[PDB]
Design a protein around this ligand. Structure first.
Ligand SMILES: N[C@@H](CCN[C@@H](CCN[C@@H](CCC(=O)O)C(=O)O)C(=O)O)C(=O)O
Ligand SMILES: N[C@@H](CCN[C@@H](CCN[C@@H](CCC(=O)O)C(=O)O)C(=O)O)C(=O)O
Ligand SMILES: CSC[C@H]1O[C@@H](n2cnc3c(N)ncnc32)[C@H](O)[C@@H]1O
Ligand SMILES: CSC[C@H]1O[C@@H](n2cnc3c(N)ncnc32)[C@H](O)[C@@H]1O
Ligand SMILES: [Br-]
Ligand SMILES: [Br-]
Lengths: 264, 264
């Protein structure tokens, strides 16, 4: 093949090379144009899933994909950290939160997921992988009236996230510091696995041990050209589970959301 | 995993296996219920494309899948053979043609493809893999006003197809007896590759030799749960080509249509 996007990706990657192994040192505002370049390709609806796979699975694309993935995960984390601190210090925390670069995408993503998971008010949700800015947990309660535990493995990040939640005056959202294994001691209707919850294999194998066959489990992943952003959940990762529904993203939303149940 | 379709598919395949033991010759009337059972699975809109490969390509579905695909291709051949002779014998050949089980699907599919391929009246089209009932060729002239060559590898099938065309009074449809390699000797604006043209690898390699980079090429394939019916065209099959458009089927239509151009 001979896709125009091949060269475009290689060119973007060449301008990321000199940041390799040091993407966490990036200036957030300064690198936004790079994210736009990457997302122009990711979000191009004329790229079919077969063509995307052709490009992204090619051995010659491996280093470029690695550069772009490192950039993406580092920019995302830094954007969250920065916004979390801004929200905590703000006189108008909800207005500050609504200005988050990704805020409108999260509203759409969650709308997708609430249909997929048939969320009902008063249901109990657990979200694995909260991060500094636990927006999903927040929305699950604020919009969907669910009762929520957010799980975050890094104690300092967990503490920051609590301050965001409390700053906003949001009720019914608690953060538990721990790994995915903390769900053993919880009772819940819906389990959600962050796009960035890692490592996938260990996480899903642990989840399998705790849930029953009725637990609605939604996990976030990347499909099509959006897989340029981050490594997709693999088939091996979800062994012992059956897929029951998917929402493929549109517009600027990055994640595909997948509903699974523990076998049988 | 633990898909309920697995058992349903295995039971269907058991029935196919038992039937094949007793008869080599298909009983077209008798097997329509089996076809419909298979198509009800194929057409299940609740199963997404990635879930479809998860359930269909699982290693312990190989035997069942191979039986179902053999059934589908053999039934289709026999239905075409039977309808072709019926058309030839009929005092009302168009009315007879329109009773072909799959007829409405062909109209919808061709509409999809005429948009995808920007078909214009008087353009020359080649269709590889005509069959006893060369409906696509017939429609390309009858509806789309194209000048058509239909290619059929089996001389007795090619001969039968010529009689169908003549019975219907359809002009501008010629049948070439030969394999895909006949295209070197033909002028054409658009090339179409039957879903059932085989073998895919050889067919595309030979096409690649004999087309230029401006030639519109549309091939037919099976995606999602419709892959239960027949082996799809792989990305490796189309090495040397780039995808430039895809139409995914709805309703009862089985084929996905893909536009490609030779590189580079
Ligand atoms: N703090 C976050 C977790 C981190 N991000 C999310 C994913 C959010 N994805 C969004 C926002 C943009 C992006 O992730 O690139 C989308 O798909 O458009 C996750 O990992 O699940 C949350 O609360 O959901
Ligand atoms: N004689 C045929 C060729 C054999 N069938 C076609 C495909 C026609 N497909 C239709 C009819 C149903 C089916 O093929 O299962 C559809 O997708 O709904 C081909 O192989 O390309 C023709 O003239 O197109
Ligand atoms: C930045 S958003 C993603 C968050 O998920 C957290 N995380 C990743 N994997 C796990 C896990 N297995 N359990 C709990 N939290 C996790 C990370 O520490 C990060 O803060
Ligand atoms: C029944 S519809 C499909 C038809 O395609 C024909 N066919 C399959 N592969 C090829 C090919 N490579 N070239 C020409 N005709 C083909 C088969 O003989 C069948 O009649
Ligand atoms: Br039966
Ligand atoms: Br008639």
């Amino acid at each position: 093949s001979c896709y125009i996007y091949w060269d475009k990706i290689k060119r973007i990657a060449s301008r990321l090379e000199g940041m390799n192994y040091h993407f966490d040192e990036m200036d957030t505002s300064g690198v936004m144009p790079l994210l736009d370049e990457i997302e122009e390709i990711a979000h191009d609806s004329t790229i079919d899933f077969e063509s995307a796979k052709h490009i992204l699975d090619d051995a010659e694309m491996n280093h470029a994909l690695s550069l772009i993935r490192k950039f993406y995960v580092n920019l995302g984390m830094k954007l969250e950290m920065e916004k979390a601190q801004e929200v905590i210090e703000s006189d108008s925390p909800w207005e500050t939160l609504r200005s988050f670069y990704f805020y409108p995408r999260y509203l759409e993503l969650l709308k997708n997921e609430a249909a997929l998971g048939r969320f009902r008010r008063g249901e109990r949700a657990v979200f694995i992988g909260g991060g500094p800015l636990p927006l999903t947990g927040i929305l699950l309660s604020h919009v969907y009236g669910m009762r929520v535990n957010v799980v975050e493995i890094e104690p300092d990040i967990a503490e920051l996230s609590r301050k965001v939640i409390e700053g906003l005056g949001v009720d019914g959202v608690n953060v538990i510091t721990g790994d995915e294994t903390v769900i053993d001691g919880l009772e819940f209707d819906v389990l959600m696995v962050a796009a960035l919850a890692e490592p996938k294999r260990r996480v899903f194998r642990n989840i399998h041990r705790y849930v029953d066959t009725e637990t609605r489990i939604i996990y976030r992943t990347y499909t099509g050209m959006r897989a340029i952003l981050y490594a997709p959940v693999s088939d091996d990762d979800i062994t012992g589970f059956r897929r029951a529904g998917v929402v493929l993203p549109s517009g600027k939303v990055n994640n595909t959301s997948v509903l699974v149940f523990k076998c049988p």
